[PDB]
Design a protein around this ligand. Structure first.
Ligand SMILES: [Mg+2]
Lengths: 1316, 66, 552
RNA sequence: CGAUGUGUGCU
DNA sequence: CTCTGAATCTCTTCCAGCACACATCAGGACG
DNA sequence: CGTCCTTCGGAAGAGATTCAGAG
């Protein structure tokens, strides 16, 4: 089965690996982020209510007051989306927050409150979205870019290489707080650890171990184990485990029980270790001076005097041995410090430490945080608790604690956001072990070390900024809390809230502006993740590796979609089938594989669990149950591409197209060409400009349908119905009864989008495509939007192409251009320039609006009305005065230079309290009657539906159809009929009728007010009237056009038909390209496009032959069946038998110009299939058919491949790129020409060409350039005199800017002067 | 080296066009510096001719007039 | 200055002065009313901070903002930076009498001249035509002449033709690496908005016709026009300044037509028949009665300037192709025939032009290379040598040597099972055997694409070199390479790893057929690596050449 | 009658 | 010892050119 | 409205500090 709409024009499918998954909904990201953001939801995570539970309740300073949270609510926005876009407001809804105050009594911690009070208090507005997800700020639709950042949490790196040239790596443990200060570790080449907070100085963490109140013995107990010597009978034998003997050389003759095992000088093998462990002897006799090299683990004070014989962090000597021996301390504790196994770092790190107690640690910390203050006890304590123990000042989220536990191989996934000592100590233990030689550092470029934030997350962050500001203000004003008279708005201040949200959506790099020239460009402007923004790095301090792709991106990040130049590999976007973890990672589907059967499911996987498994590729020849024909197969282990066994794999690639993004998805023949030109062609397809007349491509990919659906450019039928009424502006659909509401009748009434202005000054417009009286489908498009061709997305166009040289008109990127195309007008663009005209109240009174325009030409006056505004419909030239705004003594609105157009629309916005003149009131009444007629016809056709439901009730229950229609529609209810749910349904619809009365009255009056009400403007201005122009631009030789292959080009010259080569039929080619562009710029797939489109067009020509020269359904039936079967393994699966034979007429009219052909990305066609179509066509093998010259009329030797190419046009129109300035206005600070084109600016003359002039001897030239033509007013006035005299003589005088800089240094404390 | 000769330069104005102009200004201020400018870029900046080609013959003439 | 409204376009300098005068007035009032010394001490410290921030904030470790969380700009920062005074103002100058658009070719033009838009000519030369019309009396004043040329009347174009009769023009490109990026030319008035350019200047401009822009410059005084027509005239600009290279070398298309031209096959029309003059060969070939690429016996005549510039006439009879004689009529007098007596490659025609300038001087060399370019585009358009989908001819030995290297890496893996090879041993063995296999397939496709033509001679058969289109396009040396067609026809290389070592699996597929996901993924990685290298290479080269012009 | 950012695009 | 360089430390500074478009400018707070 | 107010580099590199090493 297929859609009845798809029965109009089916696509010839190609694809050999069958699918298990369709295309999911693409705009889920923004919807889910914003919906988890705002919802009346429990449990905090995630969204607004998490921030509310964090910030609330707000209590007093134990001053018997507490403001508690209740709820929040938002009503509708005051306006629509559309007139709001016309208006220049956000589409935002009133944040109405339910809050209750409780205030206690004197000695009432738990006692009775004196007053409670609760209100749903207002606090600002936040923007609601389009159902396409986006926001509009002030008539301008901007898009929030989600930001790639790292993971918050601990990380272990080395930072090797260029550190001190010692051949020595470093090691750094790096903790990233989700909210808090930086805290990282650092060693020496001399092997001692230090710590910093927020890139500050190099001081150890053993001082903060002192600050955590740990003794030296406790620290050595933490980070080390013990080695026990004892004062004994003779020579003080050692307790020994032979694992401690591993990897050593015997200092003396290793002996036990008087038996010799290892000689002195021998290295200890594991042989003798296991032999002595068979023997199991700890106590072994040691020499007295060998222990002098050991360092004691603990302190030893004397027994009699209680005085320190020897402290810890201290090596030994025999005099100390006698001093403790004459006291007789029978325990001696040392550390196992095997210098390859356990480096002695911590003991000597303590040897560095000058501080002793917790308090000197506190003083040193309090000094090093803020230098320039005297030390203070409680201030140091509060500072230390505010470092990483304060919930106010430090936290990591659930993701942060989870990845923290992931770093520690724990079990509990959750915890707090502040630190414990155990956290820091275990991180240090891991760091010591990485210093020792166990464990592995990890790159940042692993995607699990990265994380994309959401719109709701960063919105919650800004919301939290507003919350902490307003709670500081409230706890300020609750200290100012005036009893019995304060209400829950008397301390409110939504101006930080509003200022924060407006600064965020107004001034953010991530909030940037939508690209409206392409539905695909809009959706990839949505589907865009950056490496910049707040918390983002800097491009000028980023290496290659952070820009260059990592194999974790496979199946998750498209490798061939990024901008170039200043930001490469940093604005990388999402793939097709990739999705989003709850924890900000990239879950991704995989076809589960059993022992021999692919499980038909998918399953979502993390980055790190991809290393656990081994994933089968999509082009693996299974046999109908997962029976793969080999047992060894190319897979990856941990992104480790090599051939792997069949019983090893448990997972499989879902799609052959899931590896790329949606921009690459429409690009055929990728498997033959290079990604440079592929990425460039994807960029230029993003750079595409809309045409006038839509037409489908011939090489489809199947992705076009779901992209055109998910892009909001059209009307998807939200219900399945029957077409009732069609107009060019709205289409009425009568809803079928199955999806119909039980009460409140309704029919689908959708309004189109007509000729209107894009964000990029082009023609966004919607076009109907269906017939009246027609079955439709729920979830289906209804009318073509901009650059959409009959339920499909069709950007460019396709034309008659071939490859040969012709007189250098395909020289590098030159484009041979037939006259036939500019006859056919199929690349005319329509542009809309909008201007306004403000009415500011200024000095000497304001400036007026009417046509009192003195001392001007009467032709520009006669175009105006009485009110001073040219009429709608007026084709205008350049420089034409538009609205007369005379100055009190003229600054009238005028047409800019070089532009023409036609007056199409007037919009007026006048300040409230200002009288509108006759044109404004007249067009106001015009639009009033317009919307009045709109609402009236809505009420009347809903009335038609209502009494049609009443008629459908009276089909049964005493039907009197002749006694129905005689009396009018009203009392059709109470005719002869039972007292059932028929008549009760009629009563429901009568209540609906009275509701339509009251509702229509109140909506009509509200619309009267909204049109009537004055417009909020800036202070100073009185009215602003917007102007709309109709600009048409066909083509001119010199603009920039291309195709889908990185094949940039410029139209050189429009050329007649009599220059075009033509076949033996005489049909002239349209555009001819370079042969030499093919081998060097390695994009061979355009030749495949040429052959395939040539064959498809020959098929469509035979179709149009059998169509025009008429022929029955049977022969065309045979031909179309042989066409849609077509050779190899297909999933078309259609038959000609199941057709109404008149849709076949409609689909033949759809095929008379060409054939829709689907093309997979890496399951593309083969050359034998191409030759099959050529034999199915009337077309030869190579396709290099001879042609004949339009000039000489001879056969071209070595004939050329001809065909079609679905070409592309760009928004590089040279009228907005040609700019010249003989003499214009001058800058103020230096009397110099400016730049730009709006400002009529001059060309900047840089210094590279000054050096080029220095390679010449251009003495007069350089002198007249930089002095006369830039800086000196005297030189340019005298040169002006010379030119109006014909004279050629100059005097430079002095560069003014030279004097400017000299007086600037004179403004500095510098005696710089000029001598004689 | 190529940054050494740019700093070690009589043309302090060319050094001002080069990096660490502040150090150039401090060194010239403690120098009490006065410069017959010897070159190209500073003479572009002051807006006289360059002693390069035709301008070099003019500067031959200019030295000949003094 | 005000903005649009009562607010003003601010200067942070004025805020600095405001803060300093505020602090000073408060300090002097504290001096007036006998305040203690710690208070006025901190007051003086704040004043010292304010004055030093007016001097150089940012030299201090903390710089303050006024708003927008963006630190303000001090006087030293008014001086320095790449938006500094010499940077932004004193050298880089926005200058009148100039005009920027996108350029094009217009191949019929000449090197001394250039195409130029008529409306830009109307724009850029207003006071000239003002002075000329009031010189002819047809203009009353500045106002009348200005309104008449704003009307764009019929007579102003004639006076424009008078004033742009011989006035030179110059054009700039923004990556101005070396001096030949700007040259002097003669304007040709063009209906349109683009700028037509002679093809032999483009490589010196290093500019593709993708849509790159150039701007123009107006030589105002007469002496500047003298300078440009003397020094920066493109006719004077014939060689590299870096060495003795001819910088007017033809890039791709005319040399393609000529490499097509002076080839011959063994067997075609009039093979080895006799003529006496290339006029006759031209009359045969325009009739098509003879072949283009065939041996032809002609009588030829050359000249020899071995006296004191006096050219000795002599003649002979050669057997040669057709287009060599056709160009030999275009060939001026004092030349040998041995210079044009071969397949006439890219460097061959380059050194031909070199010797032509070294011997026959400047101007006949110039106009002769011009006529070369004209007839080269002529016969290139007449030929119609396309490219085909079957130009990439693939030997059957491809998959055989694939199977060979497959068996070899299988055996080295079997040795790696028991450990007969280690990691590095298997690594080196595998990279060498894939390199050798790829080189063998390269030799296979090399011979397959270079000597495939085996045709009759009027006899049975005879081999000769291949008439493949892409092989001849590479064999011209214009575009492409043997390694690049090796990437096309054969398999491509052995791609490296992200570190700098290599990946064990090469790209064994070709560009002619489809890849997997994986080989495409790896070569994509290498391509992105190369593109980032190009961008940061430009970033390095900028500051490089900055110091290079800063040193001597 | 602007100066800063902010992204965009061509080399 | 006491200076002798050397090594090693800790703070500078800079980094291609062109065009477009858009936003924001002192605003906060109290008379 | 009007007015008054205050946390991602790689280079040298240029000293600055320490050390070793002694005499
Ligand atoms: Mg270019």
């Amino acid at each position: 089965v297929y859609s009845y709409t798809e029965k109009k024009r089916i696509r010839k499918d190609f694809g050999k690996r069958p699918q298990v998954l369709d295309v999911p909904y693409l705009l889920s990201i923004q919807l889910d982020s914003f919906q988890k953001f705002i919802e009346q939801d429990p449990e905090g995570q995630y969204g607004l209510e998490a921030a509310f539970r964090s910030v609330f309740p707000i209590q007093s300073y134990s001053g018997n007051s507490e403001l508690q949270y209740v709820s929040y609510r938002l009503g509708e926005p005051v306006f629509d989306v559309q007139e709001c876009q016309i208006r220049g407001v956000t589409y935002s809804a009133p944040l109405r927050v339910k809050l209750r105050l409780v205030i206690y009594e004197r000695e009432a911690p738990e006692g009775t409150v004196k007053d409670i009070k609760e209100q749903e208090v207002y606090m600002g507005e936040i923007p609601l979205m389009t159902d396409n997800g986006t926001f509009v700020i002030n008539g301008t639709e901007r898009v929030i870019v989600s930001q790639l950042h790292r993971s918050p949490g601990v990380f272990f790196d080395s930072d090797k290489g260029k550190t001190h040239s010692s051949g020595k790596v470093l090691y750094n443990a790096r903790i990233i707080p989700y909210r808090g200060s930086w805290l990282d570790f650092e060693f020496d080449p001399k092997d001692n650890l230090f710590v910093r907070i927020d890139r500050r100085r190099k001081l150890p963490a053993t001082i903060i171990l002192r600050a955590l109140n740990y003794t030296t013995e406790q620290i050595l107990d933490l980070f080390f184990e013990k080695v026990i010597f004892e004062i004994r009978d003779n020579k003080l034998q050692m307790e020994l485990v032979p694992e401690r003997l591993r990897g050593e050389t015997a200092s003396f003759d290793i002996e036990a029980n008087g038996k010799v095992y290892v000689e002195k000088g021998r290295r200890i093998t594991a042989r003798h270790i296991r032999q002595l462990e068979k023997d199991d002897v700890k106590l072994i006799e040691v020499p007295v001076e060998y222990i002098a090299g050991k360092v004691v683990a603990k302190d030893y004070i004397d027994e009699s005097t209680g005085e320190l014989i020897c402290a810890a962090n201290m090596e030994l000597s025999l005099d100390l041995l006698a001093k403790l021996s004459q006291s007789g301390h029978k325990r001696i504790e040392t550390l196992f410090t095997n210098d390859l196994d356990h480096g002695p770092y911590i003991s000597e790190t303590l040897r560095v430490d000058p501080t002793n107690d917790r308090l000197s640690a506190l003083v040193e910390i309090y000094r090093m945080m803020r230098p320039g203050e005297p030390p203070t006890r409680e201030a140091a304590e509060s500072l230390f608790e505010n470092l990483f123990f304060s919930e106010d000042r430090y936290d990591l989220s659930a993701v942060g604690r989870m990845k923290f536990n992931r770093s520690l191989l724990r079990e509990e996934i959750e915890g707090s956001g502040i630190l414990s000592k155990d956290d820091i100590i275990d991180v240090m233990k891991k760091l010591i072990d990485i210093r020792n030689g166990k464990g592995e550092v990890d790159d940042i470029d692993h995607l699990g070390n990265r994380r994309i934030r959401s719109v709701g997350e960063m919105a919650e962050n800004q919301f939290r900024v507003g919350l902490v500001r307003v709670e500081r203000a409230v706890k300020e004003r609750l200290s100012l809390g005036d009893l019995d008279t304060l209400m829950p708005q008397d301390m409110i201040n939504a101006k930080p809230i509003s200022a924060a949200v407006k600064e965020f959506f107004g001034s953010s790099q991530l909030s940037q502006f939508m690209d409206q020239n392409n539905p695909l460009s809009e959706i990839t402007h949505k589907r865009r993740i950056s490496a910049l923004g707040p918390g983002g790095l800097t491009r000028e301090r980023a290496g290659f590796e952070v820009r260059d792709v990592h194999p974790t991106h496979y199946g998750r990040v498209c490798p061939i979609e990024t901008p170039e130049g200043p930001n490469i590999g940093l604005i990388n976007s999402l793939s097709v089938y990739a999705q989003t973890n709850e924890y900000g990672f990239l879950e991704t589907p995989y076809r589960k594989v059993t022992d021999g059967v692919v499980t038909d499911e998918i399953h979502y996987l993390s980055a790190i669990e991809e290393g656990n498994y081994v994933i089968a590729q999509a082009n693996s020849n299974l046999d109908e149950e997962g029976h793969f024909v080999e047992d060894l197969v190319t897979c990856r282990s941990k992104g480790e591409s090599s051939l792997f066994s069949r019983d090893q794999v448990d997972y499989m690639d879902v799609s052959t197209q899931q590896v790329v993004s949606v921009g690459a998805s429409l690009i055929p023949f990728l498997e033959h060409d290079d990604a440079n030109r592929a990425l460039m062609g994807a960029n230029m397809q993003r750079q595409a400009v809309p045409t006038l007349r839509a037409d489908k491509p011939l090489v489809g990919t199947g992705m076009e349908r779901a992209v055109a659906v998910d892009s909001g450019v059209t009307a998807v039928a939200k219900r399945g119905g029957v077409v009732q009424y069609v107009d060019a502006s709205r289409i009425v659909i009568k809803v079928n009864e199955d999806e119909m509401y039980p009460g409140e009748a309704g029919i689908d009434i959708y309004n189109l989008t007509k000729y209107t202005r894009s964000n990029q000054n082009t023609c966004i417009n919607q076009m109907p495509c269906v017939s009246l009286g027609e079955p439709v489908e729920r979830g289906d498009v209804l009318a073509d939007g901009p650059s959409t061709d009959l339920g499909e997305l069709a950007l460019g166009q396709n034309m008659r192409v071939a490859f040969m040289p012709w007189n250098g008109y395909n020289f590098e990127d030159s484009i041979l251009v037939s006259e036939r195309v500019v006859q056919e007008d199929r690349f005319t663009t329509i542009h809309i320039q909008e201007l306004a005209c403000v009415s500011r109240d200024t000095k000497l009174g304001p400036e007026e609006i009417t046509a009192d325009i003195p001392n001007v030409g009467e032709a520009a006056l006669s175009k105006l009305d009485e009110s001073g505004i040219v009429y709608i419909g007026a084709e205008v030239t350049g420089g034409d005065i538009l609205v007369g705004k005379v100055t009190p003594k003229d600054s009238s609105l005028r047409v800019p230079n070089g532009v023409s157009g036609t007056v199409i629309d007037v919009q007026v916005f006048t300040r409230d309290g200002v009288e509108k003149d006759k044109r404004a009131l007249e067009i106001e009444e015009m639009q009033l009657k317009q919307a009045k007629k709109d609402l009236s016809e809505e009420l009347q056709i809903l009335e038609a539906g209502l009494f049609s439901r009443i008629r459908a009730v009276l089909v049964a229950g005493g039907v009197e159809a002749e006694k129905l229609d005689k009396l009018p529609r009203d009392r059709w209810l109470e005719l002869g009929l039972t007292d059932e749910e028929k008549q009760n349904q009629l009563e429901q619809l009568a209540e609906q009728y009275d509701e339509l009365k009251h509702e229509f009255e109140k909506k009509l009056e509200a619309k009267r007010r909204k049109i009537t009400q004055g417009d909020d403007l800036a202070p100073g201005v009185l009215k602003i009237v917007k102007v709309y122009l109709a600009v048409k631009r066909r083509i001119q030789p010199g603009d920039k056009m291309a195709g889908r292959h990185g094949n940039k080009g410029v139209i050189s010259k429009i050329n007649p038909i009599e220059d075009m080569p033509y076949d033996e039929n005489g049909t002239p080619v349209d555009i001819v390209l370079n042969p030499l562009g093919v081998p060097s710029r390695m994009n061979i797939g355009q030749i495949l496009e040429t052959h395939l489109g040539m064959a498809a067009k020959g098929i469509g020509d035979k179709i149009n032959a059998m169509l025009k020269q008429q022929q029955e359904v049977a022969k065309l039936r045979e031909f179309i069946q042989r066409a849609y079967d077509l050779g190899a393994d297909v999933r078309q699966k259609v038959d000609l038998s199941t057709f109404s034979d008149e849709e076949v007429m409609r689909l033949a009219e759809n095929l008379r110009k060409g054939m829709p052909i689907a093309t997979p990305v890496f399951d593309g066609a083969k050359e034998a299939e191409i030759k099959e179509l050529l034999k199915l066509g009337d077309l030869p093998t190579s396709g290099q058919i001879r042609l004949y010259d339009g000039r000489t009329g001879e056969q071209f030797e070595r004939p050329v491949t001809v065909g079609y190419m679905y070409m592309l046009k760009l928004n590089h129109l040279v009228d907005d790129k040609m700019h010249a300035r003989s003499t214009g206005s001058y800058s103020l600070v230096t009397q110099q020409p400016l730049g730009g084109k709006a400002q009529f600016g001059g060309q900047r003359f840089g210094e590279m060409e000054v050096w080029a002039l220095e390679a010449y001897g251009a003495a007069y030239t350089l002198q007249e350039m930089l002095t006369v033509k830039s800086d000196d007013v005297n030189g340019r006035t005298k040169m002006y005199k010379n030119i109006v005299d014909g004279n050629h003589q100059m005097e430079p005088g002095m560069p003014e800017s030279f004097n400017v800089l000299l007086k600037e240094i004179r403004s500095l404390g510098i005696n710089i002067e000029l001598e004689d | 080296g190529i940054t050494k000769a740019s700093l070690a330069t009589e043309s302090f104005i060319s050094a001002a066009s080069f990096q660490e102009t502040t150090r150039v200004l401090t060194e010239a201020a403690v120098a009490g510096k006065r410069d017959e400018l010897r070159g190209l870029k500073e003479n572009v900046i002051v807006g006289r001719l360059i002693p390069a080609g035709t301008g070099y013959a003019y500067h031959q003439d200019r030295m000949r007039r003094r | 200055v005000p903005l649009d409204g009562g607010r003003f376009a601010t200067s942070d300098l004025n805020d600095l002065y405001r803060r300093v005068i505020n602090r000073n007035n408060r300090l002097k009032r504290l001096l007036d009313l006998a305040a203690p010394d710690i208070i006025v001490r901190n007051e003086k410290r704040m004043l010292q901070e304010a004055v030093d921030a007016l001097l150089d904030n940012g030299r201090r470790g903390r710089a303050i903002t006024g708003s927008n969380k963006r630190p303000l700009k001090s006087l030293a920062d008014m001086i320095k930076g790449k938006q500094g005074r010499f940077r932004q103002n004193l050298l880089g100058k926005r200058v009148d009498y100039s005009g920027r658009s996108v350029i094009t070719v217009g191949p019929y033009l000449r090197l001394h001249q250039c195409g130029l838009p008529k409306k830009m000519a109307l724009e850029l030369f207003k006071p000239f035509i003002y002075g000329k019309l009031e010189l002819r009396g047809l203009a009353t004043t500045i106002k009348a002449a200005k309104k008449m040329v704003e009307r764009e009347e019929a007579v102003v174009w004639d006076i424009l033709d008078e004033v742009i009769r011989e006035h030179p023009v110059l054009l700039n490109r923004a990556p101005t690496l070396h001096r030949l990026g700007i040259q002097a030319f003669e304007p040709v008035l063009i209906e349109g908005k683009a700028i037509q350019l002679h093809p032999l200047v483009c490589a010196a401009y290093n500019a593709d016709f993708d849509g790159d822009q150039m701007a123009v410059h107006v030589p105002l005084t007469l002496e500047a026009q003298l300078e440009a027509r003397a020094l920066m005239m493109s006719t004077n600009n014939i060689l590299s300044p870096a060495n003795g290279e001819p910088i007017i070398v033809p890039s791709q298309d005319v040399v393609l037509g000529l490499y097509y031209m002076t080839r011959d096959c063994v067997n075609a029309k009039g093979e080895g028949m006799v003529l006496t003059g290339p006029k006759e060969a031209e009359r045969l070939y325009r009739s098509g009665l003879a072949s283009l690429h065939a041996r032809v016996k002609v009588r030829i005549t050359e000249y020899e300037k071995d006296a004191n510039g006096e050219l000795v006439a002599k003649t002979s009879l050669k057997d040669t192709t057709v287009g060599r004689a056709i160009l030999w009529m275009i060939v001026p007098k004092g030349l040998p025939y041995s210079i044009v007596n071969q397949a006439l490659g890219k460097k061959a025609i380059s050194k031909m032009l070199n010797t032509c300038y070294r011997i026959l001087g400047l101007k006949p060399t110039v106009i002769f290379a011009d006529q070369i370019m004209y007839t080269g585009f002529a016969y290139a358009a007449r030929s119609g040598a396309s490219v085909g989908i079957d130009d990439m001819v693939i030997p059957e030995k491809k998959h055989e040597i694939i199977s060979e290297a497959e068996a070899e890496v299988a055996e080295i893996q079997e040795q790696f099972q028991s450990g007969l090879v280690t990691a590095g041993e298997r690594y080196n063995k595998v990279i060498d055997i894939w390199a050798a296999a790829n080189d063998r397939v390269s030799k296979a496709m090399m011979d397959n694409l270079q000597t495939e033509t085996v045709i009759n001679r009027d006899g049975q058969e005879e081999k000769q070199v291949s008439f493949n289109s892409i092989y001849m396009m590479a064999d011209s040396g214009a575009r492409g390479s043997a390694a690049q067609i090796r990437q096309l026809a054969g398999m491509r290389g052995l791609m490296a790893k992200p570190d700098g070592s290599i990946i064990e699996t090469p790209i064994t597929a070709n560009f002619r057929e489809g890849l997997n996901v994986l080989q495409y993924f790896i070569s994509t990685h290498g391509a992105r690596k190369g593109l980032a290298d190009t961008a940061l290479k430009t970033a390095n080269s900028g500051y490089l050449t900055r110091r290079l012009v800063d040193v001597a």
